[PDB]
Paper text:
Therefore, we prepared [name] fragments from a thermophilic bacterium, [name], and determined the crystal structure of a fragment consisting of residues 58 to 213 (Aa-FliF58–213) at 2.3-Å resolution. The crystal belongs to the space group of H3 and contains two essentially identical molecules in an asymmetric unit (the root mean square deviation for Cα atoms is 0.694). The structure of Aa-FliF58–213 consists of two distinct domains corresponding to RBM1 (D1; Pro58 to Ser122) and RBM2 (D2; Arg123 to Asp213). The D1 domain (FliFD1) is a compact globular domain composed of two α-helices (α1 and α2) and five β-strands (β1 to β5). β1, β2, and β3 form a core β sheet flanked by the two α-helices and another β-sheet made up of β4 and β5. The D2 domain (FliFD2) is more elongated and consists of two α-helices (α3 and α4) and four β-strands (β6 to β8 and βi). An intramolecular disulfide bridge is formed between C147 and C182 at a pole of FliFD2 but is not essential for the [name] function, as discussed later. Aa-FliF58–213 forms a dimer related by a pseudo-2-fold symmetry in the crystal, and β4 and β5 form an intersubunit β sheet with βi of the dimer mate. However, the dimer is a crystal-packing artifact because [name] forms a ring structure, and the 2-fold symmetrical dimer cannot be fitted in the cryoEM density, as shown later. We found that FliFD1 shows structural similarity to both PrgKD1 and PrgHD2, although the N-terminal α-helix of FliFD1 (α1) is longer than the corresponding helix of PrgHD2. FliFD2 resembles both PrgKD2 and PrgHD3, which adopt a common RBM fold.
The MS-ring is a transmembrane ring assembly of a single protein, [name], and has a two-tier ring structure; the S-ring is an upper ring located in the periplasm, and the M-ring is a lower ring embedded in the inner membrane. [name] is a 60-kDa protein with a large periplasmic region between two transmembrane helices. The MS-ring provides a base for the assembly of the flagellar structure. Previous sequence analysis revealed that the periplasmic region of [name] has three ring-building motifs (RBMs), namely, RBM1, RBM2, and RBM3, which are conserved in SctJ/SctD, SctJ/SctD/SpoIIIAH, and SpoIIIAG, respectively.
Author numbering:
A (entry chain A), B (entry chain B): 58 to 213
Write the structure that this text describes.
Amino acid sequence: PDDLNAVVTELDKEGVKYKISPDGRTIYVPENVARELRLKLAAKGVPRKGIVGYELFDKSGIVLSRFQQLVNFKRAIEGELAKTIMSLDCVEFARVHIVLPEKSLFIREEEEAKASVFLKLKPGCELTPEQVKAIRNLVSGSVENLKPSQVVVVDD
Amino acid sequence: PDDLNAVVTELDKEGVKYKISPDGRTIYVPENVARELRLKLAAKGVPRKGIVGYELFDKSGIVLSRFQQLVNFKRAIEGELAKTIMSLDCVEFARVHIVLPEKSLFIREEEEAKASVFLKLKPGCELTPEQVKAIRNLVSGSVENLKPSQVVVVDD
């Protein structure tokens, strides 16, 4: 019962079909509701941004909204990249976040993207500059508007 | 494209509110009114490539909607995969399309996805069984919930 009280009590008033995951950190709300909650919660609670928007609700599951599908696909791409990075002996855990351009200038043909890689390394192990460079090229190789020099790798 | 003239007349009826770029394929429309739009002209209308949803507009550029950003990312991912497949040059042109899972049951994290690979080959060359398998592995390697067997490869 952590932090869920703030939203569920203000959503209990309207009376729309919502329910909490068996865990207790993932909520399921309509897409029109999730669109109002994603930006506000991202500034508030950060965990995996576990807010799922649906198009149709059922007791067994949900029909994902189109937006939620695209969100899930992005994180799936990032999860796969992180999985490859974790194949490194020194790397125990890895997380990849690709930053998408929010604007599009008519003066430019292409908008540049950014990317951050967070690594939990093995206590005694340490990455070489060539291995880090391999990481930058791996992530940037996924899309055309992302270059290795815009991929930042940090040890958290 | 003459298809654009069939969608600028569709909006000329609906709400009369749009923005045509100096480029002949790109059409700018607010996200809130592009939300109901793409659901309509889905069948025999547009591959929704030209339609771009924004939050704000001026003569120097636009603020991309979060939805549009995710849409562009998916196409960029597919475009990059297609670019790699086209590096064979036996394949003159390639189009990659990943179909996202529509449902999320409460007893399972994520369902399985599928993908279609549209290939345009040169009249002489023909794909080898090893190459086809490599194509399926390349596309399926993008996300965890996509298997090589669920990737169909066709020859346009």
